[PDB]
Amino acid sequence: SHHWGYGKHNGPEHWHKDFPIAKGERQSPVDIDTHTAKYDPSLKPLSVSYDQATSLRILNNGHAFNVEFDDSQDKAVLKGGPLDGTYRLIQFHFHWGSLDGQGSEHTVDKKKYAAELHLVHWNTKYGDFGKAVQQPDGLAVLGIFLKVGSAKPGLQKVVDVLDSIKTKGKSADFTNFDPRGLLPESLDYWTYPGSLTTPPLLECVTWIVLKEPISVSSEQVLKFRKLNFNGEGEPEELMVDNWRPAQPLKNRQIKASFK
Numbered sequence: 001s002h003h004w005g006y007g008k009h010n011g012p013e014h015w016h017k018d019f020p021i022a023k024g025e026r027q028s029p030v031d032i033d034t035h036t037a038k039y040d041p042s043l044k045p046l047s048v049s050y051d052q053a054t055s056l057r058i059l060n061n062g063h064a065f066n067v068e069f070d071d072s073q074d075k076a077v078l079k080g081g082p083l084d085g086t087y088r089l090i091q092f093h094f095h096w097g098s099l100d101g102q103g104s105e106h107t108v109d110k111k112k113y114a115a116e117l118h119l120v121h122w123n124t125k126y127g128d129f130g131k132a133v134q135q136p137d138g139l140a141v142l143g144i145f146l147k148v149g150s151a152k153p154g155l156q157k158v159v160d161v162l163d164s165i166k167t168k169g170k171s172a173d174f175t176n177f178d179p180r181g182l183l184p185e186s187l188d189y190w191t192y193p194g195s196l197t198t199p200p201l202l203e204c205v206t207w208i209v210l211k212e213p214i215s216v217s218s219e220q221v222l223k224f225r226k227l228n229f230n231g232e233g234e235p236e237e238l239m240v241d242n243w244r245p246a247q248p249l250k251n252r253q254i255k256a257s258f259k
């Protein structure tokens with residue numbers, strides 16, 4: 001399935017035809033109504049252990065760019081909070097807008113941020129990512145909002161390699177990148193059961209959305225918007241507005257880690 005995207009003729013309103021789960025009971029993203037989310041005093045502390053993370057490569061996949069990690073040992077793991085067991089970091093990517101007033105997938109009281117970072121982790125009890133996405137507890141995604149303001153020093157290494165992966169299918173070596181440089185001070189979060197926000201839209205994700213956004217500069221997000229959805233020697237299509245809008249919450253409760 002090479003067909004879907006974010007255009008008029010292949011974007012989010014069309015996805016249900018090839019991926020009927022698009023209209024399912026636990027789709028993402030959602031609007032987080034802060035007044036309705038309930039503090040859950042039973043959530044255990046969240047543990048984000050990135051000291052031994054080993055980044056390998058950065059890839060333009062025609063939808064976004066992925067910063068990929070070595071997930072063949074327990075090097076960079078997420079556990080605690082709403083999670084049972086140990087989830088290994090496989091990749092991070094972003095979703096962003098053409099304009100600073102849109103780009104996030106989750107919203108907070110209908111507020112849209114300029115972008116959203118997704119750190120994707122898979123449950124080690126399922127052995128590999130492909131097995132994990134078939135299970136209702138297969139993935140844990142840490143979602144972090146981006147606002148435009150001060151630069152994020154720890155993002156600049158990502159920004160500066162984007163020229164080398166301008167078009168679909170281009171990759172570049174991307175070693176020794178430390179994802180701790182992308183985390184806000186507070187790990188206060190909301191959590192709910194949901195899905196991938198891209199086809200195949202599998203209902204395998206425990207979402208952990210941080211309350212505190214990070215800040216990036218106008219120049220940093222401009223470099224995101226100079227990427228291309230197209231392949232090399234194809235007509236230039238700027239990689240912008242690669243976000244899915246909020247989906248129906250249905251029979252779900254959003255829990256808060258904080259009072």
Ligand SMILES: O=C(O)c1ccccc1[SeH]
Pocket residue numbers: 093118120139141195196197198
């Ligand atoms: O599009 C992706 O790379 C993806 C993959 C896994 C979980 C969530 C997302 Se939204």
Ligand SMILES: [Zn+2]
Pocket residue numbers: 093094095118197
């Ligand atoms: Zn994503």
